[PDB]
């Protein structure tokens, strides 16, 4: 059934699973027209498909051409997402296919279930967790590949860099969701925290800076402070 | 006009014959039902006074044989039986008519209700949904499960309605996932009408039989089937103009006949609100929408 805080450790067991987040699939800017009407302009999007145990991220770039001449784009985007996740599963060797796919938004359940009819033993589940995967486009290297794309493309990343050499998956996921929540809540301040110190760099082959164990503790504290700070600003507390 | 005689009535029981019903007292001199209109299927149904558990009954057509009811004190129910000796069947019935021990099927002449509820229902199709080939009549009760219910347990005692499942490979062509899920026309017209039922009349017949089993026995799987068959049509963008015309008449008389006090359990809010107000066919069911809004405005 649904995935929540009671079964949170299930994310890090040895059953292959993927999170699918469709927030950034259909992305638009809204603007006035010459006649004073309003029009949307789509920009490139992405499906965020993540293995929370290993950090493997399957980033399918959704190029604006897929919307050309299509109607009801917000509805179509869910079905396109499900089509692409199903195609990914079919592309994976049997021993790599997930046993569960957890969608971050309940409107993805029926599209994904219908596209995965051929896989009756893959469970399609919602979650009660509020996950900040919409902020993936605040990770500079992910945003850059999406916006530079001129055609549909799949790009593979490890969203944990090399952290699993030193920490468990549970801790890596907790660090990831804290970083993404902070970038979602105050992007400018989060990036300031992550880069403020020029002597800590992002390796060419990484997404995040090369912090020591002690520096990650400091960074995580500053991210928690940011989130609390913004909550106080928001609610006047 | 034909006659369903009763050897006796040893236990107090409410007897239904189609949409009519009457109460028989324990050991009352009741010996059956006369003047049953030829040309339709019929259903004779029972609810025991001392145990309202198991509504049960028999679908039959007097054109196919001579049928009588005898209470079985071992199995504790009124059983339908076929009399193969015609001359004896006429004489015992005659005697019971002469002694005026039969109720008359109380049909008003202006009244087309039963025809309107059974227009497409044929005995031969009932006997394929309800499988007991040694009898010409079909037993149904409140607790019988459907084949689809059993898939989600005695297969001999099941209702073999046609399985409808909107999230199944049968309903969804590979490569047409969104199309077929949002517009069930493929599933309705190719899989169900052209493929399985062969024509709209057989589809309607099963829909009407499902409703009648839901209404007369409180059979829950029959209610599920009735709503699924409605939903499949209403959720199709492309339906032969005439078929929605006929759907509206069928549903109007079903809603008209439903007991007002059973609406909470016999009507699915989601299906009806979707069919009348959101579906492709939201504007094609004018008569049904009008009776639903005037009779059950709470459901909506
Ligand atoms: C005892 C009898 C045995 C037989 O005829 O094979 C069956 C019987 O009584 N049938 C009825 N027909 C009309 C009213 S009751």
PDB file of C-alpha atoms in Angstrom, chain B residues 1-256:
ATOM      1  CA  UNK B   1     -51.672 -17.312 -19.593  1.00  0.00           C
ATOM      2  CA  UNK B   2     -49.628 -19.828 -17.576  1.00  0.00           C
ATOM      3  CA  UNK B   3     -49.533 -21.045 -14.014  1.00  0.00           C
ATOM      4  CA  UNK B   4     -46.786 -21.919 -11.379  1.00  0.00           C
ATOM      5  CA  UNK B   5     -48.574 -24.145  -8.796  1.00  0.00           C
ATOM      6  CA  UNK B   6     -47.384 -24.852  -5.203  1.00  0.00           C
ATOM      7  CA  UNK B   7     -47.910 -28.320  -3.633  1.00  0.00           C
ATOM      8  CA  UNK B   8     -48.274 -26.448  -0.251  1.00  0.00           C
ATOM      9  CA  UNK B   9     -46.912 -23.497   1.864  1.00  0.00           C
ATOM     10  CA  UNK B  10     -45.641 -25.032   5.122  1.00  0.00           C
ATOM     11  CA  UNK B  11     -43.598 -22.042   6.273  1.00  0.00           C
ATOM     12  CA  UNK B  12     -44.560 -18.400   6.435  1.00  0.00           C
ATOM     13  CA  UNK B  13     -42.923 -16.582   3.538  1.00  0.00           C
ATOM     14  CA  UNK B  14     -43.047 -13.409   1.477  1.00  0.00           C
ATOM     15  CA  UNK B  15     -43.425 -14.513  -2.160  1.00  0.00           C
ATOM     16  CA  UNK B  16     -42.392 -12.283  -5.034  1.00  0.00           C
ATOM     17  CA  UNK B  17     -43.426 -12.723  -8.646  1.00  0.00           C
ATOM     18  CA  UNK B  18     -41.622 -10.157 -10.789  1.00  0.00           C
ATOM     19  CA  UNK B  19     -42.163  -6.718  -9.194  1.00  0.00           C
ATOM     20  CA  UNK B  20     -45.154  -7.961  -7.128  1.00  0.00           C
ATOM     21  CA  UNK B  21     -45.118  -9.547  -3.690  1.00  0.00           C
ATOM     22  CA  UNK B  22     -47.486 -10.976  -1.129  1.00  0.00           C
ATOM     23  CA  UNK B  23     -47.291 -12.660   2.242  1.00  0.00           C
ATOM     24  CA  UNK B  24     -48.304 -16.280   2.865  1.00  0.00           C
ATOM     25  CA  UNK B  25     -48.919 -17.481   6.405  1.00  0.00           C
ATOM     26  CA  UNK B  26     -47.606 -20.716   7.910  1.00  0.00           C
ATOM     27  CA  UNK B  27     -49.696 -23.629   6.525  1.00  0.00           C
ATOM     28  CA  UNK B  28     -52.076 -21.272   4.691  1.00  0.00           C
ATOM     29  CA  UNK B  29     -54.044 -22.965   1.836  1.00  0.00           C
ATOM     30  CA  UNK B  30     -51.958 -21.340  -0.897  1.00  0.00           C
ATOM     31  CA  UNK B  31     -51.445 -23.247  -4.132  1.00  0.00           C
ATOM     32  CA  UNK B  32     -49.695 -20.851  -6.488  1.00  0.00           C
ATOM     33  CA  UNK B  33     -49.789 -18.082  -9.040  1.00  0.00           C
ATOM     34  CA  UNK B  34     -51.999 -17.974 -12.130  1.00  0.00           C
ATOM     35  CA  UNK B  35     -52.427 -15.669 -15.156  1.00  0.00           C
ATOM     36  CA  UNK B  36     -48.670 -15.206 -15.656  1.00  0.00           C
ATOM     37  CA  UNK B  37     -48.146 -13.271 -18.926  1.00  0.00           C
ATOM     38  CA  UNK B  38     -46.679 -15.357 -21.691  1.00  0.00           C
ATOM     39  CA  UNK B  39     -43.900 -13.685 -23.636  1.00  0.00           C
ATOM     40  CA  UNK B  40     -41.498 -12.687 -20.884  1.00  0.00           C
ATOM     41  CA  UNK B  41     -39.079 -14.304 -18.526  1.00  0.00           C
ATOM     42  CA  UNK B  42     -40.291 -14.229 -14.933  1.00  0.00           C
ATOM     43  CA  UNK B  43     -38.801 -14.573 -11.480  1.00  0.00           C
ATOM     44  CA  UNK B  44     -40.477 -16.153  -8.449  1.00  0.00           C
ATOM     45  CA  UNK B  45     -38.686 -15.258  -5.247  1.00  0.00           C
ATOM     46  CA  UNK B  46     -38.849 -15.941  -1.557  1.00  0.00           C
ATOM     47  CA  UNK B  47     -37.922 -14.453   1.779  1.00  0.00           C
ATOM     48  CA  UNK B  48     -38.729 -16.550   4.804  1.00  0.00           C
ATOM     49  CA  UNK B  49     -40.629 -14.835   7.591  1.00  0.00           C
ATOM     50  CA  UNK B  50     -38.624 -16.523  10.367  1.00  0.00           C
ATOM     51  CA  UNK B  51     -35.255 -15.972   8.667  1.00  0.00           C
ATOM     52  CA  UNK B  52     -34.829 -13.076   6.261  1.00  0.00           C
ATOM     53  CA  UNK B  53     -31.347 -14.502   5.548  1.00  0.00           C
ATOM     54  CA  UNK B  54     -31.077 -15.700   1.973  1.00  0.00           C
ATOM     55  CA  UNK B  55     -33.529 -14.083  -0.319  1.00  0.00           C
ATOM     56  CA  UNK B  56     -33.645 -16.704  -3.111  1.00  0.00           C
ATOM     57  CA  UNK B  57     -35.608 -17.396  -6.272  1.00  0.00           C
ATOM     58  CA  UNK B  58     -36.009 -18.893  -9.710  1.00  0.00           C
ATOM     59  CA  UNK B  59     -35.911 -17.413 -13.196  1.00  0.00           C
ATOM     60  CA  UNK B  60     -38.193 -19.247 -15.612  1.00  0.00           C
ATOM     61  CA  UNK B  61     -40.168 -18.996 -18.837  1.00  0.00           C
ATOM     62  CA  UNK B  62     -43.512 -20.835 -18.985  1.00  0.00           C
ATOM     63  CA  UNK B  63     -42.954 -21.387 -22.707  1.00  0.00           C
ATOM     64  CA  UNK B  64     -40.181 -23.890 -21.892  1.00  0.00           C
ATOM     65  CA  UNK B  65     -42.033 -26.257 -19.575  1.00  0.00           C
ATOM     66  CA  UNK B  66     -44.506 -26.740 -16.774  1.00  0.00           C
ATOM     67  CA  UNK B  67     -42.934 -25.613 -13.420  1.00  0.00           C
ATOM     68  CA  UNK B  68     -44.292 -26.084  -9.790  1.00  0.00           C
ATOM     69  CA  UNK B  69     -42.912 -25.212  -6.301  1.00  0.00           C
ATOM     70  CA  UNK B  70     -42.644 -27.778  -3.420  1.00  0.00           C
ATOM     71  CA  UNK B  71     -41.137 -26.843  -0.008  1.00  0.00           C
ATOM     72  CA  UNK B  72     -38.257 -29.258   0.890  1.00  0.00           C
ATOM     73  CA  UNK B  73     -38.102 -29.660   4.684  1.00  0.00           C
ATOM     74  CA  UNK B  74     -34.600 -31.145   4.525  1.00  0.00           C
ATOM     75  CA  UNK B  75     -32.964 -28.282   2.614  1.00  0.00           C
ATOM     76  CA  UNK B  76     -35.399 -25.776   4.140  1.00  0.00           C
ATOM     77  CA  UNK B  77     -36.504 -24.013   0.992  1.00  0.00           C
ATOM     78  CA  UNK B  78     -39.164 -23.715  -1.681  1.00  0.00           C
ATOM     79  CA  UNK B  79     -37.797 -25.555  -4.737  1.00  0.00           C
ATOM     80  CA  UNK B  80     -38.850 -25.156  -8.336  1.00  0.00           C
ATOM     81  CA  UNK B  81     -39.500 -28.426 -10.163  1.00  0.00           C
ATOM     82  CA  UNK B  82     -40.550 -29.317 -13.714  1.00  0.00           C
ATOM     83  CA  UNK B  83     -43.624 -31.598 -14.253  1.00  0.00           C
ATOM     84  CA  UNK B  84     -42.996 -33.676 -17.449  1.00  0.00           C
ATOM     85  CA  UNK B  85     -46.543 -35.223 -17.328  1.00  0.00           C
ATOM     86  CA  UNK B  86     -48.650 -32.582 -19.051  1.00  0.00           C
ATOM     87  CA  UNK B  87     -52.113 -34.123 -18.431  1.00  0.00           C
ATOM     88  CA  UNK B  88     -51.522 -34.428 -14.633  1.00  0.00           C
ATOM     89  CA  UNK B  89     -50.073 -30.853 -14.503  1.00  0.00           C
ATOM     90  CA  UNK B  90     -53.237 -29.457 -16.143  1.00  0.00           C
ATOM     91  CA  UNK B  91     -55.605 -31.431 -13.725  1.00  0.00           C
ATOM     92  CA  UNK B  92     -53.916 -30.449 -10.392  1.00  0.00           C
ATOM     93  CA  UNK B  93     -53.695 -26.790 -11.551  1.00  0.00           C
ATOM     94  CA  UNK B  94     -57.357 -26.982 -12.718  1.00  0.00           C
ATOM     95  CA  UNK B  95     -58.453 -28.298  -9.333  1.00  0.00           C
ATOM     96  CA  UNK B  96     -56.524 -25.514  -7.511  1.00  0.00           C
ATOM     97  CA  UNK B  97     -58.085 -22.875  -9.881  1.00  0.00           C
ATOM     98  CA  UNK B  98     -61.556 -24.305  -9.276  1.00  0.00           C
ATOM     99  CA  UNK B  99     -61.021 -24.057  -5.510  1.00  0.00           C
ATOM    100  CA  UNK B 100     -59.655 -20.494  -6.004  1.00  0.00           C
ATOM    101  CA  UNK B 101     -56.442 -21.214  -4.122  1.00  0.00           C
ATOM    102  CA  UNK B 102     -54.123 -19.267  -6.442  1.00  0.00           C
ATOM    103  CA  UNK B 103     -53.236 -15.582  -6.570  1.00  0.00           C
ATOM    104  CA  UNK B 104     -53.547 -13.866  -9.919  1.00  0.00           C
ATOM    105  CA  UNK B 105     -50.526 -12.156 -11.431  1.00  0.00           C
ATOM    106  CA  UNK B 106     -51.819  -8.616 -10.810  1.00  0.00           C
ATOM    107  CA  UNK B 107     -50.916  -6.914 -14.088  1.00  0.00           C
ATOM    108  CA  UNK B 108     -52.578  -3.580 -14.859  1.00  0.00           C
ATOM    109  CA  UNK B 109     -53.392  -3.340 -18.558  1.00  0.00           C
ATOM    110  CA  UNK B 110     -51.811   0.113 -19.095  1.00  0.00           C
ATOM    111  CA  UNK B 111     -48.671  -1.160 -17.361  1.00  0.00           C
ATOM    112  CA  UNK B 112     -45.556  -2.026 -19.360  1.00  0.00           C
ATOM    113  CA  UNK B 113     -43.177  -2.051 -16.355  1.00  0.00           C
ATOM    114  CA  UNK B 114     -42.122  -5.702 -16.566  1.00  0.00           C
ATOM    115  CA  UNK B 115     -41.605  -5.595 -20.331  1.00  0.00           C
ATOM    116  CA  UNK B 116     -39.552  -2.419 -19.851  1.00  0.00           C
ATOM    117  CA  UNK B 117     -37.340  -4.126 -17.289  1.00  0.00           C
ATOM    118  CA  UNK B 118     -36.872  -7.409 -19.223  1.00  0.00           C
ATOM    119  CA  UNK B 119     -37.009  -6.291 -22.901  1.00  0.00           C
ATOM    120  CA  UNK B 120     -33.598  -7.813 -23.651  1.00  0.00           C
ATOM    121  CA  UNK B 121     -33.563 -10.635 -21.064  1.00  0.00           C
ATOM    122  CA  UNK B 122     -33.814 -14.161 -22.527  1.00  0.00           C
ATOM    123  CA  UNK B 123     -33.847 -17.474 -20.646  1.00  0.00           C
ATOM    124  CA  UNK B 124     -31.112 -18.950 -22.817  1.00  0.00           C
ATOM    125  CA  UNK B 125     -28.739 -16.181 -21.758  1.00  0.00           C
ATOM    126  CA  UNK B 126     -29.723 -16.513 -18.085  1.00  0.00           C
ATOM    127  CA  UNK B 127     -28.854 -20.224 -18.251  1.00  0.00           C
ATOM    128  CA  UNK B 128     -25.318 -19.341 -19.369  1.00  0.00           C
ATOM    129  CA  UNK B 129     -24.814 -16.885 -16.526  1.00  0.00           C
ATOM    130  CA  UNK B 130     -26.364 -19.373 -14.049  1.00  0.00           C
ATOM    131  CA  UNK B 131     -24.997 -22.837 -14.917  1.00  0.00           C
ATOM    132  CA  UNK B 132     -27.239 -25.799 -13.922  1.00  0.00           C
ATOM    133  CA  UNK B 133     -27.944 -27.455 -17.247  1.00  0.00           C
ATOM    134  CA  UNK B 134     -30.292 -30.190 -15.983  1.00  0.00           C
ATOM    135  CA  UNK B 135     -32.968 -27.567 -15.194  1.00  0.00           C
ATOM    136  CA  UNK B 136     -34.804 -25.205 -17.576  1.00  0.00           C
ATOM    137  CA  UNK B 137     -35.097 -22.592 -14.787  1.00  0.00           C
ATOM    138  CA  UNK B 138     -32.302 -20.847 -12.879  1.00  0.00           C
ATOM    139  CA  UNK B 139     -31.779 -20.471  -9.118  1.00  0.00           C
ATOM    140  CA  UNK B 140     -30.301 -17.218  -7.772  1.00  0.00           C
ATOM    141  CA  UNK B 141     -29.906 -16.045  -4.177  1.00  0.00           C
ATOM    142  CA  UNK B 142     -28.571 -13.138  -2.132  1.00  0.00           C
ATOM    143  CA  UNK B 143     -25.156 -14.672  -1.396  1.00  0.00           C
ATOM    144  CA  UNK B 144     -24.052 -16.108  -4.752  1.00  0.00           C
ATOM    145  CA  UNK B 145     -20.754 -14.611  -5.855  1.00  0.00           C
ATOM    146  CA  UNK B 146     -19.729 -13.679  -9.364  1.00  0.00           C
ATOM    147  CA  UNK B 147     -16.832 -15.162 -11.311  1.00  0.00           C
ATOM    148  CA  UNK B 148     -15.070 -11.787 -11.019  1.00  0.00           C
ATOM    149  CA  UNK B 149     -15.686 -11.719  -7.269  1.00  0.00           C
ATOM    150  CA  UNK B 150     -14.175 -15.212  -6.988  1.00  0.00           C
ATOM    151  CA  UNK B 151     -11.021 -14.157  -8.884  1.00  0.00           C
ATOM    152  CA  UNK B 152     -10.356 -11.423  -6.267  1.00  0.00           C
ATOM    153  CA  UNK B 153     -15.484 -19.856  -3.849  1.00  0.00           C
ATOM    154  CA  UNK B 154     -17.520 -22.832  -5.137  1.00  0.00           C
ATOM    155  CA  UNK B 155     -17.509 -22.378  -8.942  1.00  0.00           C
ATOM    156  CA  UNK B 156     -20.708 -24.402  -9.493  1.00  0.00           C
ATOM    157  CA  UNK B 157     -22.778 -21.878  -7.486  1.00  0.00           C
ATOM    158  CA  UNK B 158     -21.493 -18.735  -9.207  1.00  0.00           C
ATOM    159  CA  UNK B 159     -22.868 -15.979 -11.397  1.00  0.00           C
ATOM    160  CA  UNK B 160     -20.891 -16.108 -14.654  1.00  0.00           C
ATOM    161  CA  UNK B 161     -21.380 -12.502 -15.651  1.00  0.00           C
ATOM    162  CA  UNK B 162     -19.014 -11.166 -18.293  1.00  0.00           C
ATOM    163  CA  UNK B 163     -15.909  -9.851 -16.534  1.00  0.00           C
ATOM    164  CA  UNK B 164     -15.374  -6.092 -16.974  1.00  0.00           C
ATOM    165  CA  UNK B 165     -12.152  -4.612 -15.605  1.00  0.00           C
ATOM    166  CA  UNK B 166     -11.012  -1.170 -16.736  1.00  0.00           C
ATOM    167  CA  UNK B 167      -7.383  -1.774 -15.680  1.00  0.00           C
ATOM    168  CA  UNK B 168      -6.843  -5.074 -17.470  1.00  0.00           C
ATOM    169  CA  UNK B 169      -5.024  -6.041 -20.639  1.00  0.00           C
ATOM    170  CA  UNK B 170      -8.380  -6.871 -22.212  1.00  0.00           C
ATOM    171  CA  UNK B 171      -9.467  -3.236 -21.744  1.00  0.00           C
ATOM    172  CA  UNK B 172      -6.205  -1.579 -22.808  1.00  0.00           C
ATOM    173  CA  UNK B 173      -4.450  -2.032 -26.148  1.00  0.00           C
ATOM    174  CA  UNK B 174      -0.658  -1.940 -25.805  1.00  0.00           C
ATOM    175  CA  UNK B 175       0.430   1.404 -27.181  1.00  0.00           C
ATOM    176  CA  UNK B 176      -2.988   2.969 -26.600  1.00  0.00           C
ATOM    177  CA  UNK B 177      -2.792   3.178 -22.800  1.00  0.00           C
ATOM    178  CA  UNK B 178      -4.002   6.766 -22.281  1.00  0.00           C
ATOM    179  CA  UNK B 179      -6.418   6.620 -25.183  1.00  0.00           C
ATOM    180  CA  UNK B 180      -8.122   3.426 -24.087  1.00  0.00           C
ATOM    181  CA  UNK B 181      -8.205   4.307 -20.374  1.00  0.00           C
ATOM    182  CA  UNK B 182      -9.749   7.732 -20.885  1.00  0.00           C
ATOM    183  CA  UNK B 183     -12.026   6.610 -23.761  1.00  0.00           C
ATOM    184  CA  UNK B 184     -13.385   3.113 -23.336  1.00  0.00           C
ATOM    185  CA  UNK B 185     -14.857   2.941 -26.900  1.00  0.00           C
ATOM    186  CA  UNK B 186     -12.385   0.228 -27.990  1.00  0.00           C
ATOM    187  CA  UNK B 187     -13.289  -1.929 -25.023  1.00  0.00           C
ATOM    188  CA  UNK B 188     -17.045  -1.343 -25.464  1.00  0.00           C
ATOM    189  CA  UNK B 189     -17.349  -1.693 -29.225  1.00  0.00           C
ATOM    190  CA  UNK B 190     -14.598  -4.110 -30.272  1.00  0.00           C
ATOM    191  CA  UNK B 191     -13.928  -6.319 -27.227  1.00  0.00           C
ATOM    192  CA  UNK B 192     -17.384  -6.429 -25.666  1.00  0.00           C
ATOM    193  CA  UNK B 193     -20.027  -5.741 -28.350  1.00  0.00           C
ATOM    194  CA  UNK B 194     -18.376  -7.159 -31.486  1.00  0.00           C
ATOM    195  CA  UNK B 195     -16.297  -9.771 -29.661  1.00  0.00           C
ATOM    196  CA  UNK B 196     -18.098 -11.192 -26.629  1.00  0.00           C
ATOM    197  CA  UNK B 197     -21.783 -10.177 -26.666  1.00  0.00           C
ATOM    198  CA  UNK B 198     -22.087 -10.079 -30.488  1.00  0.00           C
ATOM    199  CA  UNK B 199     -24.748  -7.331 -30.322  1.00  0.00           C
ATOM    200  CA  UNK B 200     -26.165  -4.548 -28.076  1.00  0.00           C
ATOM    201  CA  UNK B 201     -29.296  -6.662 -27.282  1.00  0.00           C
ATOM    202  CA  UNK B 202     -27.270  -9.348 -25.475  1.00  0.00           C
ATOM    203  CA  UNK B 203     -25.272  -6.643 -23.638  1.00  0.00           C
ATOM    204  CA  UNK B 204     -28.472  -4.961 -22.520  1.00  0.00           C
ATOM    205  CA  UNK B 205     -29.973  -8.323 -21.488  1.00  0.00           C
ATOM    206  CA  UNK B 206     -27.108  -9.044 -19.118  1.00  0.00           C
ATOM    207  CA  UNK B 207     -27.255  -5.479 -17.735  1.00  0.00           C
ATOM    208  CA  UNK B 208     -30.986  -5.850 -17.110  1.00  0.00           C
ATOM    209  CA  UNK B 209     -30.554  -9.299 -15.489  1.00  0.00           C
ATOM    210  CA  UNK B 210     -27.817  -7.924 -13.242  1.00  0.00           C
ATOM    211  CA  UNK B 211     -30.074  -5.080 -12.059  1.00  0.00           C
ATOM    212  CA  UNK B 212     -32.981  -7.437 -11.371  1.00  0.00           C
ATOM    213  CA  UNK B 213     -30.789  -9.798  -9.321  1.00  0.00           C
ATOM    214  CA  UNK B 214     -29.420  -6.808  -7.387  1.00  0.00           C
ATOM    215  CA  UNK B 215     -32.931  -5.520  -6.705  1.00  0.00           C
ATOM    216  CA  UNK B 216     -34.804  -8.748  -5.981  1.00  0.00           C
ATOM    217  CA  UNK B 217     -32.086 -10.627  -4.023  1.00  0.00           C
ATOM    218  CA  UNK B 218     -29.845  -7.835  -2.766  1.00  0.00           C
ATOM    219  CA  UNK B 219     -27.078  -9.626  -4.653  1.00  0.00           C
ATOM    220  CA  UNK B 220     -24.047  -7.419  -4.265  1.00  0.00           C
ATOM    221  CA  UNK B 221     -21.993  -8.774  -7.179  1.00  0.00           C
ATOM    222  CA  UNK B 222     -24.964  -8.274  -9.445  1.00  0.00           C
ATOM    223  CA  UNK B 223     -25.075  -4.611  -8.407  1.00  0.00           C
ATOM    224  CA  UNK B 224     -21.364  -4.314  -9.210  1.00  0.00           C
ATOM    225  CA  UNK B 225     -21.954  -5.790 -12.662  1.00  0.00           C
ATOM    226  CA  UNK B 226     -24.905  -3.506 -13.418  1.00  0.00           C
ATOM    227  CA  UNK B 227     -22.883  -0.411 -12.559  1.00  0.00           C
ATOM    228  CA  UNK B 228     -19.822  -1.613 -14.515  1.00  0.00           C
ATOM    229  CA  UNK B 229     -21.928  -2.137 -17.627  1.00  0.00           C
ATOM    230  CA  UNK B 230     -23.425   1.352 -17.303  1.00  0.00           C
ATOM    231  CA  UNK B 231     -20.012   2.883 -16.677  1.00  0.00           C
ATOM    232  CA  UNK B 232     -18.458   1.176 -19.713  1.00  0.00           C
ATOM    233  CA  UNK B 233     -21.034   2.755 -22.041  1.00  0.00           C
ATOM    234  CA  UNK B 234     -21.000   6.183 -20.412  1.00  0.00           C
ATOM    235  CA  UNK B 235     -17.164   6.303 -20.405  1.00  0.00           C
ATOM    236  CA  UNK B 236     -17.082   5.640 -24.176  1.00  0.00           C
ATOM    237  CA  UNK B 237     -16.927   8.617 -26.537  1.00  0.00           C
ATOM    238  CA  UNK B 238     -18.240   6.586 -29.482  1.00  0.00           C
ATOM    239  CA  UNK B 239     -21.510   4.732 -28.882  1.00  0.00           C
ATOM    240  CA  UNK B 240     -24.035   3.820 -32.201  1.00  0.00           C
ATOM    241  CA  UNK B 241     -26.472   6.905 -31.587  1.00  0.00           C
ATOM    242  CA  UNK B 242     -29.441   4.445 -30.958  1.00  0.00           C
ATOM    243  CA  UNK B 243     -27.649   2.512 -28.216  1.00  0.00           C
ATOM    244  CA  UNK B 244     -27.581   5.566 -25.831  1.00  0.00           C
ATOM    245  CA  UNK B 245     -31.290   6.167 -26.757  1.00  0.00           C
ATOM    246  CA  UNK B 246     -32.012   2.610 -25.541  1.00  0.00           C
ATOM    247  CA  UNK B 247     -29.706   2.961 -22.455  1.00  0.00           C
ATOM    248  CA  UNK B 248     -31.784   5.946 -21.319  1.00  0.00           C
ATOM    249  CA  UNK B 249     -35.055   4.008 -21.521  1.00  0.00           C
ATOM    250  CA  UNK B 250     -33.606   0.980 -19.717  1.00  0.00           C
ATOM    251  CA  UNK B 251     -32.123   3.009 -16.863  1.00  0.00           C
ATOM    252  CA  UNK B 252     -35.222   5.213 -16.504  1.00  0.00           C
ATOM    253  CA  UNK B 253     -37.457   2.223 -15.780  1.00  0.00           C
ATOM    254  CA  UNK B 254     -34.890   0.661 -13.467  1.00  0.00           C
ATOM    255  CA  UNK B 255     -34.648   3.858 -11.414  1.00  0.00           C
ATOM    256  CA  UNK B 256     -38.447   4.203 -11.482  1.00  0.00           C
TER     257      UNK B 256
END
